[PDB]
Symmetry: C6
Subunit: 71 residues, 6 copies
């Protein structure tokens, strides 16, 4: 049922857009989205850290990105 979530994350991934991921505790993670599934996002820099979507509040691209639908 991720008809917007999946293509949006896929676009950020394919375009290698640096993102900020804000967590429910206010912490801010930064990096590039490497992969994701129903439950987690793999966010890359020094290592690739695995972020649980339950703990995410908002994903903020570092620059404007064009949604395609269909990814």
């Amino acid at each position: 049922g991720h008809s917007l979530q999946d293509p949006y994350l896929n676009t950020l991934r394919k375009e290698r857009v640096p993102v900020s991921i804000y967590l429910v505790n206010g912490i801010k993670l930064q990096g590039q989205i490497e992969s994701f599934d129903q439950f987690v996002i793999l966010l890359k820099n020094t290592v690739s850290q695995m972020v649980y979507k339950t703990a995410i509040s908002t994903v903020v691209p570092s620059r404007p990105v064009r949604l395609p639908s269909g990814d």
Copy 2:
């Protein structure tokens, strides 16, 4: 019943481009307009469009009264 209220409510905000605030469970206030949404996230536009997980949302507050 859901989302018999939530969907038309967000869709109205979307179509009418109503300025809104989205308050998160940590207390953070996001501001902008609803660009689109699905079952689990809302895309909120301002300088970029940020994707907000509904799990993390407490309230959505339109900047003005909206119809149905």
Copy 3:
């Protein structure tokens, strides 16, 4: 939902002033305008949509009918 629906419907139909406390301790006040499985529309200055996942307790301002 067995208990929520009648309880919220009584509050709505009777226009009972209510407080809704959120999981982070914030207190909202107003009246129930409508609801569905996942959200409550809380009226005052404007109608704000509250996600039930973010609600801890709903406290009426006066006693409400059984149930």
Copy 4:
């Protein structure tokens, strides 16, 4: 289910005063009037509806056996 329901039911039937602590740390107190899969109705001056998703612990004021 197998523990939760009989436990809340016992508290309800025996009218045992309980404290319910929420995930934010706030303490509610009253007697459990009814409950379902999602909420507990907790009675004193008014009956307040508590979402189980927001509960940490239910602490009975006295020893209860199920």
Copy 5:
């Protein structure tokens, strides 16, 4: 599930003292009297039912040897 269940059942059967840390940082202590899919019943100085949704970590006072 395949790990949580034998782990909790072992702590129960062997009356292992545990500390249960909640998502708000609060610490509960006691021994596990019983549990089901959604709650843990903790007993001792304080007797109480704990919702797993609110738990961050279960820290046994000594390591558990699993089946």
Copy 6:
């Protein structure tokens, strides 16, 4: 996208006994090696042994790069 990323990722950390830090939703940082895990919990071990609910985890951060899934 991804199929199940979580299992092979946790399995690599488990099998290779890779030191990890697990950050919880309240900001608390746990450290150790992944002893085992299932769909809902992770058993972490070293200075303290403990069972962590995934519902309470924000991010798992390996101490060193982990092989491609």
